[PDB]
């Protein structure tokens, strides 16, 4: 019981895709390697069923046919990412520009722009050029902010003339925590038999993410943003953090456990140095800015995206790493009973109420002047041996999406200026280290054939972009 009317008439409905795990055509129109290339090439053990994006599900190839699929769902935005490695091959501009890659871009802009649908543009969404992680350990080094700016600048100059929105980044939390202190994701770091050192590399990460960030929306503001009038903003993602119980002890936890993965960059861009427990705890490991980068850091965004899948509860803990420097257990259970109902891998726990929490949340303690929810999504178990009759009535999806709707609804209610929702995955995707095992989307894809087909939530969702 969520209709489109209860949303202002100005908000905006979209879902989303990414290059590493939409495109494919890994070894085609000149893209050189990515580091999620090479993870999955040289560790397919590191990967749950040993699979890669070479293909993924072809989106290179099928781009016009996705588009089409997009006008019949009535999105009004489509989010997506550029393959920095599909424009640059070595990422630096001396390896040479890609003008098959640049083709590419402007076919698939193009194409949304004549069916309707408004594009919205991730410079970075995981897949480093592999070159730079040669060259000099890509965001282990400072050098990867003038880089990663003219990168941000060829995309302003090449395509910024028909696009309105631009993240720096989507979600540099799992990126530098799932790379550099678990090996779970490329580059593969800090893991036990990784190298790396879980303690140090993803703080010089994040900080080297934090100044890349920055350089690109000056680019923006000062060169690009008057003449092509769009936005540039960041995607953070995070749990919502439940005291387990109402003591001290434990509310302390919360506002640990928020601010080592919220606070971590929206600190840096609201005040410009990182949280109090921050700095506290993690000492001599965490790196200071300049009185210049902390400066240009206050308020260095237009928007922050916020992406969502589950709640924890939260409360205080009993070799460092990045894992144990907050000092908060993490525990989905109260009394034996969940916070919300359990799905297929055993993290996401449908719990709605978590986003409305984290909203008004992230407006009390930061005071964001605009929020999207940029990702917004559940998973569900890849059953093989099943008809794609079956697989296709997801009700269970439609329900999730309507109550975070609920909850979106509730935040606008109470005075937090979020003016999008953006359904993670619109296409079955890649799922990076799970490989195909699982599925977020709201159109099926048959991972092998590459055939689309419409889940019910697409057609609940058409329904509801309707109204
Ligand atoms: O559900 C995982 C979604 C991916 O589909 C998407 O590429 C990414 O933005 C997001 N990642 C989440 C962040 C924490 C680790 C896995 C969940």
């Given at each position: 019981?969520?209709?489109?009317?209860?949303?202002?008439?100005?908000?905006?409905?979209?879902?989303?895709?990414?290059?590493?795990?939409?495109?494919?055509?890994?070894?085609?129109?000149?893209?050189?390697?990515?580091?999620?290339?090479?993870?999955?090439?040289?560790?397919?053990?590191?990967?749950?069923?040993?699979?890669?994006?070479?293909?993924?599900?072809?989106?290179?190839?099928?781009?016009?046919?996705?588009?089409?699929?997009?006008?019949?769902?009535?999105?009004?935005?489509?989010?997506?990412?550029?393959?920095?490695?599909?424009?640059?091959?070595?990422?630096?501009?001396?390896?040479?520009?890609?003008?098959?890659?640049?083709?590419?871009?402007?076919?698939?802009?193009?194409?949304?722009?004549?069916?309707?649908?408004?594009?919205?543009?991730?410079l970075?969404?995981?897949?480093?050029?592999?070159?730079?992680?040669?060259?000099?350990?890509?965001?282990?080094?400072?050098?990867?902010?003038?880089?990663?700016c003219?990168?941000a600048?060829?995309?302003?100059?090449?395509?910024?003339?028909?696009?309105?929105?631009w993240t720096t980044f989507?979600?540099?939390?799992?990126?530098?925590?799932?790379?550099?202190?678990?090996?779970?994701?490329?580059?593969?770091?800090?893991?036990?038999?990784?190298?790396?050192?879980?303690?140090?590399?993803?703080?010089?990460?994040?900080?080297?993410?934090l100044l890349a960030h920055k350089a690109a929306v000056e680019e923006y503001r000062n060169?690009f943003q008057?003449?092509?009038?769009?936005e540039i903003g960041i995607?953070?993602?995070?749990?919502?953090?439940?005291?387990?119980?109402?003591?001290?002890?434990?509310?302390?936890?919360?506002?640990?456990?928020?601010?080592?993965?919220?606070?971590?960059?929206?600190?840096?861009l609201?005040?410009?140095?990182?949280?109090?427990?921050?700095?506290?705890?993690?000492?001599?490991?965490?790196?200071?800015?300049?009185?210049?980068?902390?400066?240009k850091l206050?308020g260095c965004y237009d928007?922050?995206?916020?992406?969502?899948?589950?709640?924890?509860?939260?409360?205080?803990?009993?070799?460092?790493?990045?894992?144990?420097?907050?000092?908060?257990?993490?525990?989905?259970?109260?009394?034996?009973?969940?916070?919300?109902?359990?799905?297929?891998?055993?993290?996401?726990?449908?719990?709605?109420?978590?986003?409305?929490?984290?909203?008004?949340?992230?407006?009390?303690?930061?005071?964001?002047?605009?929020?999207?929810?940029?990702?917004?999504?559940?998973?569900?178990?890849?059953?093989?041996?099943?008809?794609?009759?079956?697989?296709?009535?997801?009700?269970?999806?439609?329900?999730?999406?309507?109550?975070?709707?609920?909850?979106?609804?509730?935040?606008?209610?109470?005075?937090?200026?979020?003016?999008?929702?953006?359904?993670?995955?619109?296409?079955?995707?890649?799922?990076?280290?799970?490989?195909?095992?699982?599925?977020?989307?709201?159109?099926?894809?048959?991972?092998?054939?590459?055939?689309?087909?419409?889940?019910?939530?697409?057609?609940?969702?058409?329904?509801?972009?309707?109204?």
């Amino acid at each position: 019981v969520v209709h489109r009317r209860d949303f202002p008439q100005d908000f905006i409905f979209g879902a989303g895709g990414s290059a590493y795990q939409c495109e494919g055509a890994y070894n085609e129109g000149n893209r050189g390697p990515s580091i999620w290339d090479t993870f999955t090439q040289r560790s397919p053990a590191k990967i749950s069923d040993g699979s890669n994006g070479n293909q993924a599900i072809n989106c290179y190839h099928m781009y016009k046919e996705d588009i089409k699929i997009m006008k019949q769902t009535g999105l009004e935005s489509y989010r997506f990412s550029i393959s920095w490695s599909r424009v640059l091959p070595g990422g630096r501009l001396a390896a040479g520009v890609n003008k098959d890659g640049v083709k590419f871009y402007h076919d698939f802009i193009d194409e949304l722009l004549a069916n309707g649908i408004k594009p919205s543009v991730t410079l970075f969404h995981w897949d480093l050029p592999q070159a730079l992680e040669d060259e000099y350990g890509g965001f282990l080094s400072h050098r990867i902010v003038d880089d990663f700016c003219e990168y941000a600048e060829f995309c302003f100059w090449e395509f910024g003339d028909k696009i309105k929105y631009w993240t720096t980044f989507n979600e540099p939390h799992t990126f530098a925590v799932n790379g550099y202190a678990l090996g779970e994701f490329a580059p593969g770091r800090g893991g036990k038999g990784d190298e790396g050192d879980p303690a140090i590399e993803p703080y010089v990460v994040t900080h080297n993410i934090l100044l890349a960030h920055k350089a690109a929306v000056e680019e923006y503001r000062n060169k690009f943003q008057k003449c092509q009038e769009g936005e540039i903003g960041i995607v953070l993602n995070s749990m919502w953090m439940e005291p387990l119980s109402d003591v001290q002890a434990d509310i302390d936890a919360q506002k640990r456990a928020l601010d080592f993965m919220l606070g971590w960059f929206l600190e840096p861009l609201t005040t410009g140095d990182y949280p109090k427990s921050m700095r506290e705890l993690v000492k001599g490991r965490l790196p200071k800015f300049s009185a210049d980068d902390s400066e240009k850091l206050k308020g260095c965004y237009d928007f922050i995206g916020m992406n969502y899948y589950t709640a924890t509860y939260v409360t205080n803990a009993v070799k460092l790493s990045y894992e144990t420097d907050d000092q908060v257990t993490k525990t989905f259970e109260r009394n034996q009973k969940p916070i919300g109902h359990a799905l297929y891998g055993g993290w996401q726990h449908v719990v709605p109420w978590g986003l409305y929490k984290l909203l008004v949340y992230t407006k009390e303690t930061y005071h964001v002047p605009v929020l999207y929810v940029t990702e917004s999504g559940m998973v569900e178990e890849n059953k093989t041996k099943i008809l794609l009759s079956e697989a296709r009535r997801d009700a269970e999806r439609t329900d999730y999406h309507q109550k975070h709707l609920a909850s979106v609804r509730d935040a606008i209610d109470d005075g937090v200026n979020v003016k999008g929702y953006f359904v993670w995955s619109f296409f079955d995707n890649f799922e990076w280290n799970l490989g195909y095992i699982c599925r977020y989307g709201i159109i099926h894809v048959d991972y092998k054939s590459f055939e689309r087909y419409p889940k019910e939530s697409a057609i609940w969702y058409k329904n509801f972009i309707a109204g």
